[PDB]
């Protein structure tokens, strides 16, 4: 299955996940610190690694 670009953890549907619009890695929302609500106010998401 898909693995979190941050912690290497497995996708499970009891967790919120978000994808980077630049590098297209998938992440735990918890690892990159984005809640579902926060993500709603975000158009193009840039993951922490991509902000560097």
């Amino acid at each position: 299955d898909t693995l979190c670009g941050s912690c290497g953890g497995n996708y499970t549907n009891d967790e919120f996940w978000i994808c980077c619009d630049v590098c297209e890695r998938w992440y735990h929302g918890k690892c990159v610190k984005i809640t579902p609500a926060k993500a709603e106010s975000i158009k193009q998401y840039k993951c922490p690694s991509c902000c560097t």
């Binding site: 996708y11 549907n13 978000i18 994808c19």
Partner: peptide, 7 residues
């Protein structure tokens, strides 16, 4: 953004 929501 692209997301996977909680079931």
């Amino acid at each position: 953004a692209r997301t996977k929501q909680t079931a």
